Design an enzyme around this catalytic site. Structure first.
Site, PDB file in Angstrom:
ATOM      1  N   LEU A  75       0.670  -0.761   0.350  1.00  0.00           N
ATOM      2  CA  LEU A  75       0.211  -0.061  -0.319  1.00  0.00           C
ATOM      3  C   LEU A  75       1.477   1.644   0.457  1.00  0.00           C
ATOM      4  CD1 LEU A  75      -2.808  -1.481   2.312  1.00  0.00           C
ATOM      5  CD2 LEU A  75      -2.702  -0.887  -0.130  1.00  0.00           C
ATOM      6  N   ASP A  76       0.281   2.106  -1.255  1.00  0.00           N
ATOM      7  CA  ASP A  76       1.134   3.862  -0.741  1.00  0.00           C
ATOM      8  C   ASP A  76       0.470   4.413   0.601  1.00  0.00           C
ATOM      9  OD1 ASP A  76       2.415   5.367  -1.523  1.00  0.00           O
ATOM     10  OD2 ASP A  76       1.428   6.493  -3.138  1.00  0.00           O
TER      11      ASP A  76
END
Ligand SMILES: CCCCCCCCCCCCCCCCCC(=O)OC[C@H](COP(=O)([O-])OCC(O)COP(=O)([O-])OC[C@@H](COC(=O)CCCCCCCCCCCCCCCCC)OC(=O)CCCCCCCCCCCCCCCCC)OC(=O)CCCCCCCCCCCCCCCCC
Ligand SMILES: CCCCCCCCCCCCCCCCCC(=O)OC[C@H](COP(=O)([O-])OCC(O)COP(=O)([O-])OC[C@@H](COC(=O)CCCCCCCCCCCCCCCCC)OC(=O)CCCCCCCCCCCCCCCCC)OC(=O)CCCCCCCCCCCCCCCCC
Ligand SMILES: CCCCCCCCCCCCCCCCC[C@@H](O)O[C@H](CO[C@H](O)CCCCCCCCCCCCCCC)COP(=O)(O)OCC[N+](C)(C)C
Ligand SMILES: CCCCCCCC/C=C\CCCCCCCC(=O)OC[C@H](COP(=O)(O)OCCN)OC(=O)CCCCCCC/C=C\CCCCCCCC
Ligand SMILES: CCCCCCCC/C=C\CCCCCCCC(=O)OC[C@H](COP(=O)(O)OCCN)OC(=O)CCCCCCC/C=C\CCCCCCCC
Ligand SMILES: CCCCCCCC/C=C\CCCCCCCC(=O)O[C@H](COC(=O)CCCCCCC/C=C/CCCCCCCC)COP(=O)(O)OCCN
Ligand SMILES: CCCCCCCCCCCC(=O)SCCNC(=O)CCNC(=O)[C@H](O)C(C)(C)COP(=O)(O)O
Lengths: 128, 63, 182, 84, 88, 175, 178, 52, 459, 124, 61
Positions: free
Chosen positions: E42-43
């Site tokens: 995930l960013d």
């Protein structure tokens, strides 16, 4: 572009709109680091004094003592008669008195003249 | 029963005390309680005197 | 004689009994809010009578019962005006306050100081009743300042909150600006 | 007496974007090559008893039908009584 | 108030519920200790959006300084328990 | 009530209307006042009767103090302290009496304003004129003496006013 | 709140904070959920265009025009959580929070009720008395010379040790004491 | 004192002050109960002109 | 009048012969009994006065002040009981002796049929107060404070003595009765102007006037609690009593001469009320509030109307009680915290609720909430000044607003908010302190029932 | 409204000022000039003590409305005929006031026209 | 003019209802000056709670 926000004395500049923080230099980073170091040293001293179970009473704060002493007892020894100080003192201490004296004297002179001529209509005026 | 005691110790006793105080002490002095002098309308009769107020001037009544 | 005066004064008088009992044992139990609510409801249903008398006849009255100080030709006395405005507003305010306290018994159920909350509400009601029925300017001023102080106390109910204290002092400031003209 | 009944959460697969304005948002987002990653999280606001809405005028006329029926009944009774 | 006294199991259940409705996450691959940066790819913006979701779910707001260093569901649950004073 | 004089505090005859029920519906006011009478007025009256008979069992009296007239400040020598003391005391008593007179007239005025209701502007002109005259006299007597007032200051004010009046009358006659 | 602050904020921290603030104020502007979702994905798309930007001067030029744009359209009345520093119940229950040491001033007749509580409290007091004497030496030996540089405290490293300066963090009154 | 960080753990949370730090000369004038200088969405000049 | 004076004198041998651990009990009991005896003086007449003998006379201006003076001594003993615990018995007896001498001097001052005797006792009150301030004060500034409190006073009072004897050389007497009955107008002359100034400034320095008020914050902050109470409650009222007694011979010169002092007081009440807003010290704040109230009393006395005199009498009594209560509350805070700074000890309502109730009542009565006698005096003075000139109402409204502002500021800063975390030595309030506040506050709310008892000889 | 527009955007002299109305003698229009009639005298209208602003030519119907309100008290909807009569009397009073307004306006217009005709005759 | 109170009431009703119904549209614009003036209470609480008080308190010190 968007209309510019103009800071004032009572509405200061926002933290994120300063030109200063965006200009980062190693000297600025060192200054911030030593500011945090001073703050952390003070915090460590306070917490060491605070969490002590043997402690009773109030943790005396030198900063508060300095603040109160500077506000109260450090004014006159550091006072110097200056054209600014002399003018401000004379104005703020004499002008209101003479202004109010002129106002009240004029009002009472008009009242006295009116009562002397009898055209004041003081009917039912019994309590004074 | 709770309301029976409540209406006695919170309404009846205070109203007794205030009525006694108003009827026997406050009204002993003049002008302490001043009324409104109720309205008199034509055709009414006064209990004190027994006389009747004459009626009005029989205005033309229509609609 | 003429139950108008007795009933009108009795309403205000019985509005004060829970304040007297605030030092008794009932103030330390959970039955105090219901006690105050019932007292307010009884006061409302008792004050409904002079309203009916006024509606039937138009009865008006002045009750100058207790004589306070007299300053030379000026006489100051505890005097109540029972005109149309007073006998009309008292039942409405009592009804609204009764509803308010019934709602408060559910809204402030988790408040540790709920008896003090109801005592404060009753004190405000007493001060407002003093304000409405006042026949001279001094008694009206007494009610004027009483409602203001009670609003100050109730606005800053959560005294740990800075903004509540700020709002209370704001109300006091503006009301004093009005008190200048009063 | 407090609310200790051991409430259990529903199934996460129940909440679908289909049939809601979130679908319309997804369709508009696909026209530009974008997708919402939190679309299903807000589906419950349109799923159960919240699916059917009422208008403003409908809200104002909450009890107009019963009131109108009672009104006509009372008017008929009054008309049949006064005509005597 | 009349608020049920939520517990650790309830907090974890709601956190996992919100995370399972995040379609960027495969529900069958997520876990209580599953990392956000590496275990889930995930960013950082995705992590902050998860913080939004937790905030809007539990009704209280997490300060940025605390929120930016929360990377596992378990530590989010622990932080929320510490904030809300949860016994068990 | 005999407790106060009707002449000092006059009242109109207080004519009141008769009930004229135009409907067979029974009003709540009569029933409410009857139950109030039964539940309140009777016990109060019985308690008052008991208290009154208890008072009658022990009767005693008090008297209104009367004061002789004494030479006033005009019949006092310049430095004779005894006569000035007596005159000052008499003047203070008269000042209190005049204050009470103004109080009585003001009470009359207030009672008129409340009693006459919506027509107070016309039905209370007599009391307004009475209070105007009494207030004018009182103001002429004591308006501007201020604190530390004395009989001598009042006499000086009266002398100044009457000197002005005499001069004005002389000029008007000699106009 | 709990974690110690840093000497400065990095660029990515500032970008994330601006993203948070912009999303919150956009949610405040867009009351309804679908409209907010649409505009939130639009704002995220507008944000991620410069994700791979490498010029730091250009990166600082970015996010700054963005803060200016945010300040222009910042919804003067944003939504605030009730317990947040701007909320309507920020410090409602601060008046119900009483210090723990007040219990030491109770009358013995008051302590007669709740005896088990005061027994456990005595156990806690003993634990604090020993642990503090250990903690002072722990912090003195672990601290860098010349004074601390960051207001972060070390954990416990021995077996019977406790975290230094723990008493006033563990014994907070409550979040809702009454 | 209003515009100071409300999320920092001050030693005086209500006053938003730390123990040993220097105190402003006009501290009692800025105590969150009195005049605050926090930035506003609209510029001061614009608000003044609009209200007037 | 000797039925009050002799027991006060006998308080000294009883104090010096008491056991080492029974001085406080004996002193308190017998002081309360003396106050009960002094209550009999309240039965005054609408006639001249209560002339007991050639030396002492009473009045409805003197009687309330005498009652307050007698009632203040037990409260002073009760408040001094705390911080004198570690003191030797001889020094405690000396402190009680100073208090008793002060009470005797005040009692003999307030009756004082003659002006030179009044001056002698009016200055005799100086010595015990100076000793109390400069011996049992805590800080190092007390000595300096004492110097101020002395010399200011003498700077005004030595000319007065001259004027007084001069009057006795012309009039032939200084008896109050003969002075009133034989009063003659003062011609508008330079000699008469300076005689007016000499007669007036001695009492105007003790109120104090706005320009001459510098000694008061020093003396109040530096003195012990009993010294602060006796300074704020009674010693400030000596100047008002003196002006009320001596303005009879000054007419009609008062009309012209009153303008500078009226301007000074009307602007100084605003100035000191504003000063109270920015204060880091509780005692300094209470002292400046006292200055504002006495400025209003000065305005009332200078206007010289019956309503002015009634309002001034009521306001002196009310301010005495209220200021003593406020100083007691601040002292109770100080004995726990040992700092005497408002901002340090916070959130005290959560820790001491009943003391917070006492604080609220004291602030409400200082704020002049009706129907308190504070409000009665305030309103009477305001009405008389409005009759004097309609433009005064602006200044009085400003003063009322600022008074409310700073009173509620002082209450909120100390009682409301969040408690200081590190302050942990705040013990529950003792029965002695609560009884002290109750005995301060109950007479005020009892006197609001019978205001005519404190409205002076012009009622 | 239209009279306000006609007066504030037109000329002032065409329409009257409500403060000074009327500015013309009563019988200037027609000479018979009947007098307005009154039913309630001083004494009984004072006894009913209505109000100072309520003592107009419609007083008698107000007296009877008050008589109904006092007599049939619990039935506060009993006497509705008298309320209608009093409303009708006040309606007639207001209509007469409007007629007076219009009469004064027409007299003013006629006077202006006569002055203009005289000026034109003098000019020619 | 007998119905003016009514027609004003319904006119306000419909106008505000129509202005509120547009919030559902998927369009966003920055606020105008009128909205800012109305939302911040005519800016009266800002200036009047900052300009006088400061200028008072500062002087008082
Ligand atoms: C209203 C009518 C009441 C009549 C009934 C009789 C009441 C007698 C009380 C006499 C005065 C009290 C003595 C002062 C010390 C307080 C005692 C105490 O320690 O409390 C512990 C006790 C036990 O509580 P606790 O749980 O153990 O402690 C919790 C904490 O302490 C936490 O404490 P708290 O938060 O609970 O606070 C306690 C409470 C109470 O504490 C106080 O603050 C009391 C102070 C009240 C006034 C403040 C000064 C202002 C000047 C007014 C002076 C008027 C006095 C009249 C004569 C008095 C006779 C002595 O505070 C308040 O509620 C604020 C009151 C503000 C009132 C403002 C309105 C002023 C005008 C009111 C009308 C007066 C004249 C009317 C004339 C026309 C109508 C006939 O609490 C009480 O008993 C409360 C007292 C009842 C409320 C009184 C409020 C109004 C009464 C005014 C005086 C009486 C009026 C006379 C007839 C009027 C009709
Ligand atoms: C004689 C014939 C009789 C019939 C007359 C004609 C019949 C009716 C015709 C219609 C006439 C206008 C009605 C529409 C009103 C405008 C509504 C609108 O579009 O708002 C959105 C729009 C902007 O919205 P936005 O910024 O995008 O907000 C974003 C969201 O929508 C934010 O939305 P939100 O969710 O936050 O909340 C929505 C809220 C938020 O919306 C707002 O912001 C409201 C602000 C504007 C609406 C208020 C209009 C009331 C005007 C009062 C003015 C008093 C004098 C002030 C003097 C100021 C001096 C500088 O809007 C509302 O709740 C409803 C708005 C109120 C409309 C309902 C009642 C208004 C009708 C009554 C007006 C007059 C008729 C009287 C009736 C009796 C017949 C005589 O507002 C405007 O553009 C303003 C339009 C008019 C404002 C006039 C003031 C301009 C002053 C400039 C300076 C002038 C020179 C001064 C020189 C001084 C130097 C010394
Ligand atoms: C420090 C804080 C305050 C301390 C106390 C201050 C209060 C004391 C102030 C004294 C009040 C004024 C003193 C004299 C007032 C007389 C009226 C005079 O000022 O007005 C004119 C007087 O004109 C001039 O003022 C003449 C005097 C000028 C010299 C005086 C010095 C002026 C300023 C000094 C102030 C310093 C005060 C402090 C000294 C240490 C009227 O003209 P005239 O009709 O002809 O004189 C009438 C009087 N007669 C009939 C007896 C002759
Ligand atoms: C209660 C328990 C006792 C119950 C049995 C007694 C029932 C009533 C019988 C009592 C006898 C009547 C009585 O008390 O005497 C009247 C007596 C007054 O005596 P007077 O001579 O008329 O006037 C004083 C000057 N001489 O009345 C009273 O004092 C008692 C009732 C007074 C009213 C209640 C007081 C309420 C207000 C308190 C004061 C508030 C501040 C002042 C308000 C200012 C308003 C301008
Ligand atoms: C003349 C009036 C002079 C004003 C006196 C100034 C006194 C200054 C000291 C007060 C103490 C400081 C203070 O109270 O703090 C300011 C405090 C905090 O502001 P908030 O908006 O509540 O912030 C909360 C969100 N954080 O605000 C206030 O309460 C101050 C209020 C000052 C109002 C002054 C303006 C009044 C002007 C009135 C003019 C109109 C007169 C009436 C006309 C009608 C006549 C028919
Ligand atoms: C708080 C500190 C303030 C100090 C007080 C200052 C005010 C007092 C006035 C100064 C002293 C004057 C004392 C006068 C004593 C009264 C006696 C009297 O008035 O008799 C006069 C005497 O009048 C004088 O002699 C006055 C001369 C003054 C000499 C000393 C001056 C001191 C400084 C004065 C300047 C300050 C003036 C204002 C001070 C206000 C306070 C700041 C008449 O004298 P005879 O010759 O007997 O009469 C026959 C002829 N007609
Ligand atoms: C209604 C209010 C209006 C608000 C308007 C706001 C304006 C919107 C436009 C914003 C403009 C920008 O994108 S400003 C662009 C600034 N320049 C950069 O971002 C370059 C490198 N970016 C990073 O490093 C970040 O941390 C990132 C990789 C994104 C995350 O990293 P993570 O991997 O650690 O999550």
């Amino acid at each position: 572009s968007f209309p510019k926000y103009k800071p004032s004395r009572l509405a200061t500049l926002p933290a994120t709109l300063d030109p200063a923080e965006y200009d980062i230099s190693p000297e600025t980073r060192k200054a911030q680091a030593e500011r945090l170091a001073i703050r952390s040293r003070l915090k460590r001293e306070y917490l060491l004094q605070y969490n002590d179970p043997n402690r009773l009473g109030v943790i005396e704060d030198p900063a508060l003592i300095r603040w109160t002493y500077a506000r109260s007892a450090n004014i006159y020894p550091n006072f110097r008669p200056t054209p600014k100080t002399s003018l401000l003192g004379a104005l703020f201490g004499i002008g209101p008195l003479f202004f109010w004296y002129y106002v009240f004297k004029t009002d009472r002179d008009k009242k006295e003249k009116l009562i002397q001529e009898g055209k004041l209509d003081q009917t039912f005026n019994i309590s004074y | 029963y709770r309301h029976s005691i409540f209406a006695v110790t919170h309404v009846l006793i205070p109203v007794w005390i205030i009525h006694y105080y108003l009827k026997y002490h406050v009204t002993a002095k003049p002008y302490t309680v001043v009324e409104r002098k109720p309205r008199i309308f034509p055709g009414d009769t006064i209990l004190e005197t027994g006389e009747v107020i004459p009626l009005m001037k029989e205005f033309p009544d229509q609609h | 004689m003429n139950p108008f005066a007795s009933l009108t004064l009795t309403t205000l008088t019985i509005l004060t009994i829970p304040i007297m009992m605030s030092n008794s044992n009932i103030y330390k139990t959970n039955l105090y809010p219901n006690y105050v609510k019932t007292t307010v409801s009884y006061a409302f249903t008792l004050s409904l009578v002079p309203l009916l008398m006024f509606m039937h006849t138009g009865q008006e009255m002045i009750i100058s019962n207790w004589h306070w100080m007299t300053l030379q030709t000026v006489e100051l006395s505890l005097s109540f005006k029972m005109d149309y405005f007073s006998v009309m507003f008292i039942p409405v305010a009592l009804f609204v306050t009764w509803s308010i306290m019934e709602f408060s018994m559910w809204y402030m159920h988790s408040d540790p100081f709920i008896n003090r909350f109801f005592k404060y509400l009753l004190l405000f009601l007493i001060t407002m009743m003093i304000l409405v029925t006042a026949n001279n300017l001094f008694q009206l001023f007494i009610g004027w300042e009483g409602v203001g102080i009670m609003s100050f106390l109730l606005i800053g109910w959560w005294h740990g909150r800075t903004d509540a204290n700020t709002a209370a002092l704001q109300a006091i400031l503006y009301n004093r600006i009005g008190d200048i003209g009063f | 007496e407090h609310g200790h009944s051991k409430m259990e959460l529903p199934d996460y697969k129940q909440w679908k974007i289909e049939g809601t304005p979130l679908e319309t948002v997804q369709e508009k987002l696909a026209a530009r090559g974008l997708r919402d990653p939190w679309g299903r999280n807000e589906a419950w606001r349109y799923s159960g008893g919240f699916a059917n809405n009422v208008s403003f005028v409908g809200a104002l006329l909450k009890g107009f039908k019963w009131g109108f029926a009672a009104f006509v009944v009372a008017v008929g009774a009054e008309y049949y009584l006064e005509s005597q | 108030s009349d608020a049920p006294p939520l517990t650790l199991e309830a907090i974890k259940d709601r956190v996992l519920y919100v995370l399972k409705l995040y379609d960027k996450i495969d529900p069958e691959k997520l876990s209580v200790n599953s990392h956000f940066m590496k275990d889930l790819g995930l960013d950082s913006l995705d992590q902050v959006e998860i913080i939004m979701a937790m905030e809007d779910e539990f009704g209280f707001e997490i300060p940025d300084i605390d929120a930016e260093k929360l990377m596992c569901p378990q530590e989010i649950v622990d932080y929320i328990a510490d904030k809300k004073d949860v016994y068990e | 009530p005999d407790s106060w004089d009707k002449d000092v505090y006059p009242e109109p005859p207080r004519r009141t209307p008769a009930p004229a029920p135009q409907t067979s519906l029974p009003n709540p006011v009569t029933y409410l006042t009857k139950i109030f009478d039964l539940l309140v007025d009777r016990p109060v009256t019985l308690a008052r009767e008991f208290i009154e008979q208890q008072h009658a069992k022990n009767r005693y009296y008090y008297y209104h103090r009367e004061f002789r007239r004494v030479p006033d400040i005009t019949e006092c020598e310049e430095k004779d302290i005894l006569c000035m003391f007596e005159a000052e005391m008499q003047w203070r008593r008269d000042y209190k009496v005049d204050q009470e007179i103004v109080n009585i007239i003001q009470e009359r005025l207030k009672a008129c304003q409340q009693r006459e209701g919506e027509s107070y502007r016309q039905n209370c002109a007599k009391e307004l004129e009475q209070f105007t005259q009494v207030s004018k006299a009182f103001q002429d007597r004591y308006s501007d003496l201020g604190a530390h007032y004395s009989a001598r200051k009042c006499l000086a004010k009266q002398k100044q006013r009457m000197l002005a009046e005499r001069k004005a009358a002389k000029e008007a006659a000699a106009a | 709140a709990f974690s110690a602050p840093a000497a400065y904020l990095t660029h990515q921290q500032k970008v994330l904070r601006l993203y948070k603030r912009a999303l919150r104020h956009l949610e405040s502007w867009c009351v309804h959920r679908d409209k907010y979702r649409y505009f939130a994905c639009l704002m995220r798309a507008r944000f991620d265009e410069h994700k791979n930007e490498k010029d730091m001067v250009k990166a600082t030029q970015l996010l700054r025009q963005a803060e200016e744009e945010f300040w222009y359209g910042q919804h003067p009345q944003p939504y605030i959580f009730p317990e947040s520093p701007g909320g309507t119940s920020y410090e409602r229950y601060e008046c119900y929070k009483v210090p723990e040491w007040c219990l030491d001033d109770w009358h013995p007749s008051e302590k007669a009720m709740y005896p088990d509580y005061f027994a456990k409290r005595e156990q806690w007091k003993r634990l604090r008395r020993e642990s503090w004497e250990r903690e002072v030496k722990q912090l003195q030996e672990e601290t860098p010379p010349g004074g601390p540089r960051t207001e972060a405290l070390p954990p416990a490293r021995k077996e019977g040790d406790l975290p230094p300066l723990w008493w006033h963090i563990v014994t907070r009154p409550r979040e809702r004491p009454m | 004192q209003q515009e100071r960080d409300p999320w920092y753990d001050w030693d005086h949370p209500d006053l938003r002050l730390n123990w040993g730090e220097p105190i402003h000369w006009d501290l009692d004038m800025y105590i969150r109960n009195r005049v605050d200088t926090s930035p506003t969405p609209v510029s001061w000049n614009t608000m003044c002109k609009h209200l007037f | 009048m000797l039925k009050i004076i002799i027991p006060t004198t006998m308080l000294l041998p009883m104090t010096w012969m008491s056991k080492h651990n029974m001085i406080w009990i004996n002193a308190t009991v017998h002081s309360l009994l003396i106050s009960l005896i002094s209550l009999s003086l309240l039965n005054q007449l609408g006639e001249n006065s209560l002339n007991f003998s050639l030396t002492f006379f009473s009045d409805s201006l003197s009687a309330p002040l005498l009652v307050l003076t007698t009632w203040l001594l037990p409260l002073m003993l009760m408040a001094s009981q705390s911080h004198l615990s570690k003191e030797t018995t001889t020094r405690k007896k000396l402190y009680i002796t100073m208090l008793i001498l002060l009470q005797l001097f005040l009692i003999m001052t307030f009756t004082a049929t003659e002006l030179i005797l009044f001056y002698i006792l009016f200055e005799a009150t100086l010595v015990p107060t100076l000793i109390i301030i400069t011996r049992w004060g805590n800080q190092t500034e007390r000595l300096n404070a004492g110097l101020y409190f002395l010399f200011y006073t003498l700077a005004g009072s030595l000319p007065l003595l001259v004027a007084l004897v001069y009057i006795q050389n012309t009039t032939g007497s200084l008896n109050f009765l003969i002075i009133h009955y034989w009063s003659h107008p003062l011609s508008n002359s330079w000699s008469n102007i300076f005689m007016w100034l000499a007669c007036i400034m001695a009492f105007m320095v003790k109120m104090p006037l706005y320009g001459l008020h510098l000694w008061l914050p020093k003396a109040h902050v530096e003195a012990p609690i009993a010294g602060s109470m006796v300074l704020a409650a009674v010693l400030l009222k000596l100047g008002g009593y003196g002006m009320m007694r001596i303005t009879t011979i000054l007419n009609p010169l008062t009309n012209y001469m009153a303008y500078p002092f009226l301007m000074l007081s009307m602007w100084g009440m605003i100035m000191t009320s504003s000063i109270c807003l920015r204060q880091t010290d509780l005692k300094s704040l209470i002292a400046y509030s006292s200055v504002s109230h006495m400025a209003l009393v000065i305005v009332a006395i200078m206007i010289q109307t019956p309503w002015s005199f009634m309002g001034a009498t009521a306001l002196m009594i009310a301010h005495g009680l209220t200021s003593s209560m406020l100083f007691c509350l601040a002292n109770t805070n100080y004995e726990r915290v040992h700092s005497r700074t408002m901002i340090l000890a916070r959130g005290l309502q959560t820790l001491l609720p009943l003391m917070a109730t006492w604080w609220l009542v004291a602030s409400l009565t200082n704020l002049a909430l009706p129907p308190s006698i504070n409000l009665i005096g305030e309103l009477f003075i305001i009405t008389a000044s409005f009759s004097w000139s309609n433009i005064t109402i602006i200044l009085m409204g400003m003063n009322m607003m600022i008074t409310a502002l700073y009173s509620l500021y002082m209450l909120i800063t100390t009682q409301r908010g969040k408690y200081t975390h590190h302050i942990n030595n705040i013990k529950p309030s003792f029965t002695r302190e609560n009884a002290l506040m109750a005995l301060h506050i109950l007479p005020l709310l009892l006197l609001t029932l019978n205001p005519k008892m404190i409205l002076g000889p012009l009622y | 409204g239209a009279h306000l527009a006609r007066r504030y955007l037109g000329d002032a002299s065409k329409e009257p000022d409500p403060l000074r109305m009327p500015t013309f003698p009563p019988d200037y229009g027609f000479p018979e000039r009947k007098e307005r009639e009154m039913v309630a005298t001083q004494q009984e209208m004072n006894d009913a003590q209505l109000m100072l602003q309520q003592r107009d030519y419609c007083a008698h119907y107000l007296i009877q409305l008050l008589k109904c309100k006092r007599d049939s008290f619990p039935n506060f909807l009993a006497c509705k005929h008298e309320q209608h009569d009093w409303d009708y009397c006040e309606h007639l009073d207001y209509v007469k006031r409007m007629k007076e307004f219009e009469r004064e306006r027409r007299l003013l217009q006629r006077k202006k026209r006569r002055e203009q005709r005289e000026a034109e005759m003098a000019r020619g | 003019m007998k119905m003016t109170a009514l027609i004003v009431t319904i006119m306000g009703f419909m106008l505000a209802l129509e202005l509120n119904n547009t919030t559902y549209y998927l369009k966003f614009k920055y606020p105008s000056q009128t909205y800012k003036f109305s939302n911040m209470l005519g800016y009266y609480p800002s200036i009047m709670h900052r300009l006088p008080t400061y200028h008072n308190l500062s002087m008082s010190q």
